[PDB]
Design a protein around this ligand. Structure first.
Ligand code: HEM
Length: 213
Protein backbone atom coordinates (compact mmCIF):
# COMPACT_ATOMS: atom_id res chain seq x y z
CA UNK A 1 0.00 0.00 0.00
CA UNK A 2 1.49 3.45 -0.92
CA UNK A 3 2.55 5.57 2.12
CA UNK A 4 0.13 8.43 1.18
CA UNK A 5 -2.78 6.00 1.25
CA UNK A 6 -1.54 4.30 4.44
CA UNK A 7 -1.39 7.66 6.17
CA UNK A 8 -4.87 8.72 4.98
CA UNK A 9 -6.31 5.43 6.17
CA UNK A 10 -4.36 5.43 9.46
CA UNK A 11 -5.47 9.01 10.37
CA UNK A 12 -9.04 9.23 9.03
CA UNK A 13 -10.67 8.31 12.39
CA UNK A 14 -8.53 10.56 14.58
CA UNK A 15 -9.08 13.30 11.96
CA UNK A 16 -12.81 13.07 12.63
CA UNK A 17 -12.10 13.38 16.36
CA UNK A 18 -9.73 16.35 15.83
CA UNK A 19 -12.05 18.31 13.53
CA UNK A 20 -14.70 17.82 16.21
CA UNK A 21 -12.67 18.99 19.19
CA UNK A 22 -14.71 21.50 21.07
CA UNK A 23 -12.22 24.32 20.31
CA UNK A 24 -12.57 23.50 16.56
CA UNK A 25 -16.35 23.11 16.74
CA UNK A 26 -16.57 26.53 18.35
CA UNK A 27 -14.08 27.93 15.81
CA UNK A 28 -16.14 26.43 12.89
CA UNK A 29 -19.36 27.94 14.23
CA UNK A 30 -17.68 31.24 14.18
CA UNK A 31 -17.29 31.51 18.06
CA UNK A 32 -13.54 32.32 17.98
CA UNK A 33 -12.41 35.49 19.90
CA UNK A 34 -9.07 37.44 19.73
CA UNK A 35 -8.15 35.86 23.10
CA UNK A 36 -8.58 32.30 21.88
CA UNK A 37 -7.12 32.92 18.48
CA UNK A 38 -4.00 34.53 20.03
CA UNK A 39 -3.52 31.49 22.26
CA UNK A 40 -3.74 29.06 19.37
CA UNK A 41 -1.53 31.00 16.97
CA UNK A 42 1.12 31.55 19.67
CA UNK A 43 1.12 27.79 20.33
CA UNK A 44 1.51 27.10 16.59
CA UNK A 45 4.40 29.58 16.56
CA UNK A 46 6.29 27.32 18.98
CA UNK A 47 5.20 24.11 17.24
CA UNK A 48 6.24 25.16 13.73
CA UNK A 49 9.44 26.66 15.04
CA UNK A 50 10.39 23.30 16.45
CA UNK A 51 9.16 21.33 13.44
CA UNK A 52 11.07 23.53 10.99
CA UNK A 53 14.24 23.45 13.08
CA UNK A 54 14.09 19.72 12.80
CA UNK A 55 13.31 19.84 9.07
CA UNK A 56 16.44 22.06 8.66
CA UNK A 57 18.50 19.59 10.69
CA UNK A 58 17.35 16.72 8.45
CA UNK A 59 17.02 18.53 5.05
CA UNK A 60 19.69 16.33 3.39
CA UNK A 61 18.73 13.11 5.10
CA UNK A 62 17.09 10.86 2.50
CA UNK A 63 14.39 9.69 4.87
CA UNK A 64 12.97 13.22 4.64
CA UNK A 65 14.68 15.19 1.85
CA UNK A 66 12.07 14.53 -0.90
CA UNK A 67 9.58 16.53 1.24
CA UNK A 68 11.89 19.43 1.80
CA UNK A 69 9.70 22.39 0.64
CA UNK A 70 10.68 25.44 2.62
CA UNK A 71 9.60 28.07 0.16
CA UNK A 72 6.14 26.63 -0.36
CA UNK A 73 5.32 25.28 3.10
CA UNK A 74 7.35 26.64 5.99
CA UNK A 75 5.29 28.74 8.43
CA UNK A 76 7.67 30.24 10.98
CA UNK A 77 8.20 33.55 9.19
CA UNK A 78 4.42 33.89 8.62
CA UNK A 79 3.83 33.17 12.30
CA UNK A 80 6.40 35.77 13.31
CA UNK A 81 4.44 38.34 11.23
CA UNK A 82 1.20 37.17 12.89
CA UNK A 83 2.74 37.32 16.38
CA UNK A 84 3.80 40.97 15.80
CA UNK A 85 0.27 41.72 14.54
CA UNK A 86 -1.54 40.09 17.49
CA UNK A 87 0.89 40.68 20.29
CA UNK A 88 2.75 43.81 19.12
CA UNK A 89 6.45 44.70 18.77
CA UNK A 90 7.57 42.90 21.97
CA UNK A 91 5.74 39.78 21.13
CA UNK A 92 8.64 37.52 21.87
CA UNK A 93 8.37 38.17 25.59
CA UNK A 94 4.50 38.43 25.62
CA UNK A 95 3.60 35.11 23.96
CA UNK A 96 2.56 32.09 26.04
CA UNK A 97 4.17 28.69 25.86
CA UNK A 98 1.60 26.27 27.28
CA UNK A 99 2.38 22.83 28.71
CA UNK A 100 0.57 21.00 25.91
CA UNK A 101 2.56 23.10 23.45
CA UNK A 102 5.79 22.12 25.27
CA UNK A 103 4.81 18.48 25.04
CA UNK A 104 4.33 18.72 21.26
CA UNK A 105 7.68 20.56 20.87
CA UNK A 106 9.39 17.90 22.99
CA UNK A 107 8.16 15.12 20.72
CA UNK A 108 9.19 17.12 17.64
CA UNK A 109 12.77 17.40 18.94
CA UNK A 110 12.78 13.68 19.83
CA UNK A 111 11.68 12.77 16.34
CA UNK A 112 14.03 15.16 14.56
CA UNK A 113 17.00 14.30 16.74
CA UNK A 114 16.56 10.54 17.30
CA UNK A 115 13.85 9.20 14.90
CA UNK A 116 14.17 11.34 11.72
CA UNK A 117 12.57 8.67 9.55
CA UNK A 118 9.37 9.61 11.38
CA UNK A 119 9.63 13.39 10.74
CA UNK A 120 7.51 12.93 7.57
CA UNK A 121 4.54 12.01 9.86
CA UNK A 122 4.72 15.42 11.63
CA UNK A 123 5.14 17.40 8.42
CA UNK A 124 2.24 15.53 6.82
CA UNK A 125 -0.04 16.06 9.82
CA UNK A 126 0.45 19.82 10.03
CA UNK A 127 1.16 20.99 6.41
CA UNK A 128 -1.49 18.99 4.61
CA UNK A 129 -4.12 20.08 7.10
CA UNK A 130 -3.03 23.74 6.69
CA UNK A 131 -3.80 23.29 2.95
CA UNK A 132 -7.16 21.71 3.70
CA UNK A 133 -9.16 22.55 6.81
CA UNK A 134 -6.82 25.42 7.52
CA UNK A 135 -8.14 27.17 4.36
CA UNK A 136 -11.76 26.76 5.72
CA UNK A 137 -10.68 28.06 9.12
CA UNK A 138 -8.91 31.07 7.55
CA UNK A 139 -12.21 32.19 5.93
CA UNK A 140 -14.16 31.69 9.14
CA UNK A 141 -11.51 33.65 11.06
CA UNK A 142 -11.72 36.57 8.60
CA UNK A 143 -15.39 36.78 8.98
CA UNK A 144 -15.64 36.29 12.66
CA UNK A 145 -12.84 38.67 13.68
CA UNK A 146 -13.08 41.21 10.86
CA UNK A 147 -9.67 40.48 9.42
CA UNK A 148 -8.92 42.19 6.08
CA UNK A 149 -8.60 40.31 2.83
CA UNK A 150 -5.10 41.83 2.54
CA UNK A 151 -4.02 39.13 4.98
CA UNK A 152 -2.71 40.80 8.06
CA UNK A 153 -3.05 38.58 11.13
CA UNK A 154 -3.62 35.42 8.98
CA UNK A 155 -0.17 35.10 7.31
CA UNK A 156 -0.09 31.57 8.75
CA UNK A 157 -3.01 30.53 6.60
CA UNK A 158 -1.60 32.16 3.43
CA UNK A 159 0.65 30.26 1.01
CA UNK A 160 1.87 32.82 -1.54
CA UNK A 161 4.20 30.22 -3.11
CA UNK A 162 1.43 27.71 -3.80
CA UNK A 163 -0.94 28.58 -6.61
CA UNK A 164 -3.23 25.64 -6.06
CA UNK A 165 -3.35 23.81 -2.71
CA UNK A 166 -5.21 20.80 -4.30
CA UNK A 167 -2.51 20.28 -6.88
CA UNK A 168 0.35 20.86 -4.30
CA UNK A 169 -1.17 18.25 -1.98
CA UNK A 170 -1.32 15.77 -4.83
CA UNK A 171 2.39 16.42 -5.57
CA UNK A 172 3.23 16.08 -1.86
CA UNK A 173 1.40 12.75 -1.58
CA UNK A 174 3.13 11.40 -4.65
CA UNK A 175 6.51 12.56 -3.26
CA UNK A 176 5.78 10.83 0.03
CA UNK A 177 5.41 7.61 -2.02
CA UNK A 178 9.03 8.01 -3.17
CA UNK A 179 10.52 7.71 0.27
CA UNK A 180 12.40 4.56 0.94
CA UNK A 181 9.83 2.32 2.57
CA UNK A 182 9.88 -0.93 4.47
CA UNK A 183 7.15 -2.49 6.53
CA UNK A 184 8.85 -1.17 9.74
CA UNK A 185 9.08 2.38 8.53
CA UNK A 186 5.58 2.35 7.13
CA UNK A 187 4.05 0.96 10.34
CA UNK A 188 5.90 3.44 12.51
CA UNK A 189 5.35 6.51 10.28
CA UNK A 190 1.58 5.85 10.37
CA UNK A 191 1.70 5.39 14.16
CA UNK A 192 3.62 8.63 14.58
CA UNK A 193 1.04 10.47 12.45
CA UNK A 194 -1.72 9.23 14.83
CA UNK A 195 0.41 10.58 17.72
CA UNK A 196 0.79 13.86 15.93
CA UNK A 197 -3.00 14.11 15.66
CA UNK A 198 -3.35 13.36 19.39
CA UNK A 199 -0.80 16.08 20.29
CA UNK A 200 -2.97 18.50 18.39
CA UNK A 201 -6.17 17.27 20.04
CA UNK A 202 -4.53 17.67 23.49
CA UNK A 203 -3.42 21.16 22.64
CA UNK A 204 -6.99 22.10 21.61
CA UNK A 205 -8.42 20.56 24.73
CA UNK A 206 -5.96 22.49 26.82
CA UNK A 207 -6.63 25.81 25.10
CA UNK A 208 -10.37 25.34 25.46
CA UNK A 209 -9.93 24.70 29.20
CA UNK A 210 -7.73 27.84 29.53
CA UNK A 211 -10.39 29.89 27.89
CA UNK A 212 -13.24 28.41 29.94
CA UNK A 213 -11.34 28.44 33.36
C1 HEM B 1 -12.21 22.18 11.71
C2 HEM B 1 -11.06 21.58 11.52
C3 HEM B 1 -10.81 20.88 10.26
C4 HEM B 1 -11.50 20.74 9.05
C5 HEM B 1 -12.76 21.44 8.60
C6 HEM B 1 -10.59 19.86 8.31
C7 HEM B 1 -10.97 19.50 6.98
C8 HEM B 1 -10.25 18.68 6.09
C9 HEM B 1 -10.73 18.37 4.74
C10 HEM B 1 -12.04 18.72 3.97
C11 HEM B 1 -9.63 17.50 4.22
C12 HEM B 1 -9.44 16.77 2.89
C13 HEM B 1 -8.45 17.41 1.89
C14 HEM B 1 -8.03 16.64 0.59
O1 HEM B 1 -8.55 15.47 0.40
O2 HEM B 1 -7.10 17.16 -0.19
C15 HEM B 1 -8.63 17.45 5.31
C16 HEM B 1 -7.39 16.72 5.19
C17 HEM B 1 -6.37 16.71 6.18
N1 HEM B 1 -6.49 17.23 7.37
FE1 HEM B 1 -8.02 18.32 8.20
N2 HEM B 1 -9.54 19.40 8.99
C18 HEM B 1 -9.64 20.02 10.15
C19 HEM B 1 -8.70 19.84 11.20
C20 HEM B 1 -7.49 19.09 11.07
C21 HEM B 1 -6.55 19.07 12.23
C22 HEM B 1 -6.69 19.52 13.66
C23 HEM B 1 -5.45 18.37 11.59
C24 HEM B 1 -4.20 17.94 12.18
C25 HEM B 1 -3.68 18.57 13.10
C26 HEM B 1 -5.78 18.06 10.21
C27 HEM B 1 -5.01 17.40 9.23
C28 HEM B 1 -5.36 16.94 7.95
C29 HEM B 1 -4.43 16.19 7.13
C30 HEM B 1 -3.04 15.68 7.50
C31 HEM B 1 -5.16 16.01 5.93
C32 HEM B 1 -4.75 15.28 4.68
C33 HEM B 1 -5.30 13.88 4.68
C34 HEM B 1 -4.71 13.10 3.49
O3 HEM B 1 -5.09 13.48 2.37
O4 HEM B 1 -4.00 12.11 3.68
N3 HEM B 1 -7.03 18.55 9.85
N4 HEM B 1 -9.03 18.11 6.52
Amino acid sequence: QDLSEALKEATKEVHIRAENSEFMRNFQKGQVSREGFKLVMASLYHIYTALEEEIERNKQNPVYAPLYFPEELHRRAALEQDMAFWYGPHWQEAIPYTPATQHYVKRLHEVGGTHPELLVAHAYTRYLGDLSGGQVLKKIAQKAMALPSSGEGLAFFTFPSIDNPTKFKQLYRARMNTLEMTPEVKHRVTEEAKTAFLLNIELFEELQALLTE
